[PDB]
């Protein structure tokens, strides 16, 4: 994997150094329906006029981005998305901006969020959870090799494609850093303790997040939950985890090594790096090459009735995207 990553880094750097810009325009698409929403924007299913292809358009109101102080974060998201390339990372097809908004046009992943399937079904069996987990492990290995930290892992951001494989979306908090950073960001249930304690953290927070994700997928509920964020932080800081009766011995051990407050012990960060995870008993049945190559039998393949079908997504109240005859925040988003 050393040779692969070496070549992949070179490919990344060229794009990180000279990012693409203005590859489309609003009038080239017909906006159809909202697919999902987040704190900073909304994602819509759209159809490209000239090609007839469908895409998922993320729309960001520039003024809201400023108010919520996400300027630098939004610039991070777009610069990173246009430079990466991995089988489990959603593809940025186009990007552009207008007087009022910022746009990121991605490939439409019709299977819906893992979140919806997870809550409906209740929980995923271990082999089922392991299939998704393997893909995230590989994605983090790739991202971390480029000095990138994801920072927002959660079922809501993991889409299922037509083959049953995962496609990671939302790089709103993704950042390229060598060393440590201090931003208090992410989603409450997934924050590593270092983040909450404001001590400064590194890539290891992504590995702790993986632990939370695996736990949520296998249990059906997160390891630390409560009605209010602050109550959740107290549980995370205390650190004591409780496991369902159906969790295998191997799963509980892997988890104790991921949901580990001690950085000198948490898997993924140690000397052997990612191999401590890959070689773990819980993953003994995993063929890492086959997973990467997508040759493994997907345990679940979503129902899809042609292009433009959004049946795997909830419905959302539609909102008219505003326009203005005056350019807003021009200098702030110059590089977008």
């Amino acid at each position: 994997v050393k040779e692969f990553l070496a070549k992949a880094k070179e490919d990344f750097l060229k794009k990180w150094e000279t990012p693409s810009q203005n590859t489309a325009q609003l009038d080239q698409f017909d906006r159809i329906k909202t697919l999902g929403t987040g704190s900073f924007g909304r994602v819509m299913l759209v159809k490209h006029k000239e090609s007839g292809n469908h895409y998922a358009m993320k729309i960001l109101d520039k003024q809201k981005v400023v108010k919520l102080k996400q300027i630098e974060h939004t610039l991070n998201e777009k610069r990173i998305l246009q430079a990466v390339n991995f089988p489990f990372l959603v593809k940025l097809e186009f990007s552009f901006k207008d007087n009022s908004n910022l746009y990121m046009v991605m490939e439409y992943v019709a299977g819906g969020e893992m979140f919806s399937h997870l809550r409906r079904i209740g929980r995923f069996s271990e082999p089922h959870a392991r299939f998704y987990a393997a893909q995230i492990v590989l994605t983090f290995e790739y991202l971390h090799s480029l000095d990138l930290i994801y920072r927002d892992l959660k079922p809501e951001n993991l889409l299922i494609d037509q083959q049953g494989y995962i496609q990671v979306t939302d790089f709103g908090f993704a950042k390229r850093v060598k060393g440590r950073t201090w931003t208090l960001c992410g989603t409450p249930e997934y924050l590593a303790p270092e983040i909450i304690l404001s001590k400064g953290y590194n890539k290891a927070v992504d590995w702790w997040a993986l632990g939370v994700l695996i736990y949520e997928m296998a249990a059906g509920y997160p390891p630390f939950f409560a009605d209010q964020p602050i109550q959740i932080y107290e549980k995370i800081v205390s650190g004591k985890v409780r496991f369902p009766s159906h969790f295998s011995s191997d799963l509980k051990d892997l988890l104790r090594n991921l949901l580990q407050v001690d950085l000198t012990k948490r898997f993924g960060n140690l000397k052997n790096g990612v191999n401590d995870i890959k070689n773990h008993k819980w993953f003994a049945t995993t063929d890492w090459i086959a997973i990467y190559q997508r040759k493994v039998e997907a345990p679940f393949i979503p129902k899809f009735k042609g292009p433009g079908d959004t049946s795997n997504f909830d419905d959302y109240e539609e909102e008219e995207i505003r326009v203005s005859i005056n350019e807003k925040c021009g200098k702030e988003f110059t590089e977008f």
Binding site: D152, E156, P188, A226
Partner: peptide, 20 residues
């Protein structure tokens, strides 16, 4: 049960990223 306490809680729906 832990499941019942979760299901009866206010955080069973889509969770948004933290925003100041």
């Amino acid at each position: 049960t832990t499941y019942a306490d979760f299901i009866a809680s206010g955080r069973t729906g889509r969770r948004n990223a933290i925003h100041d």
